[PDB]
Design a protein around this ligand. Structure first.
Ligand SMILES: [Ca+2]
Ligand SMILES: [Ca+2]
Ligand SMILES: [Zn+2]
Ligand SMILES: [Zn+2]
Ligand SMILES: [Zn+2]
Ligand SMILES: [Zn+2]
Ligand SMILES: [Zn+2]
Lengths: 201, 9
């Protein structure tokens, strides 16, 4: 079963397929990575098979990167304008981080304001406490709750949500801590997260 | 891998 490592959804259709990197194995919605609606590759014209190879941006550059915004090494990355790397999901959820091209989600331009938040909050969900003050934490978005976590640490716990397009919320990406989360949403998100972990390995 | 657009209905 294919799960997108950015949004943890499992729907895969001809318009938005969940694809897989043929080197590191990560799986992602075309539309969650800016690789949607692109013509078949030139290597693909050869084969008569129904599929063509695909590689994420980090593998295209021969790196197994770390993220400027969190301590996790898993998931899928985009290059920054300074030659560093960030998770797609970190860039979506961290305030003040935007994509320079929304259609292809590239590149990511991090600012002095982003860097001044490094280590500024302690991640309350880090399993390795040695990294709880690396990177940049987001907070719970319920009321004035001041609970902080890395984006990818919240993702694992099933805490990242995305508003539907019809809801017309300007920033549709939000997170709640466990105290304020939707219990059903957390259930299926952790389930898809765990299936994604078993899938890659 | 990725499914070619030619093979997408
Ligand atoms: Ca952002
Ligand atoms: Ca947000
Ligand atoms: Zn997705
Ligand atoms: Zn890869
Ligand atoms: Zn990250
Ligand atoms: Zn953390
Ligand atoms: Zn909260």
């Amino acid at each position: 079963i294919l799960i997108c490592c950015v949004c943890l959804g499992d729907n895969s259709e001809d318009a938005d397929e969940i694809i897989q990197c043929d080197n590191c194995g990560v799986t992602v919605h075309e539309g969650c990575y800016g690789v949607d609606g692109e013509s078949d590759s030139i290597m693909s014209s050869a084969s008569e098979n129904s599929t063509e190879p695909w590689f994420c941006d980090a593998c295209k550059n021969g790196v197994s990167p770390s993220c400027e915004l969190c301590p996790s090494q898993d998931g899928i990355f985009k290059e920054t304008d300074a030659g560093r790397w960030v998770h797609v999901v970190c860039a979506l959820y961290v305030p003040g981080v935007a994509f320079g091209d929304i259609d292809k989600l590239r590149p990511v331009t991090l600012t002095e304001m982003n860097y001044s938040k490094y280590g500024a909050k302690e991640c309350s969900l880090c399993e390795d406490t040695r990294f709880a003050r690396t990177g940049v934490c987001i907070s719970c978005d319920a009321g004035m709750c001041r609970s902080f976590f890395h984006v990818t640490c919240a993702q694992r716990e099933g805490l990242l949500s995305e508003a539907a397009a019809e809801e017309d919320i300007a920033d549709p990406f939000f997170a709640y801590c466990k105290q304020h989360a939707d219990r059903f949403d957390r259930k299926w998100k952790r389930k898809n997260y765990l299936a994604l972990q078993s899938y890659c390995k | 891998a990725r499914t070619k657009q030619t093979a997408r209905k």
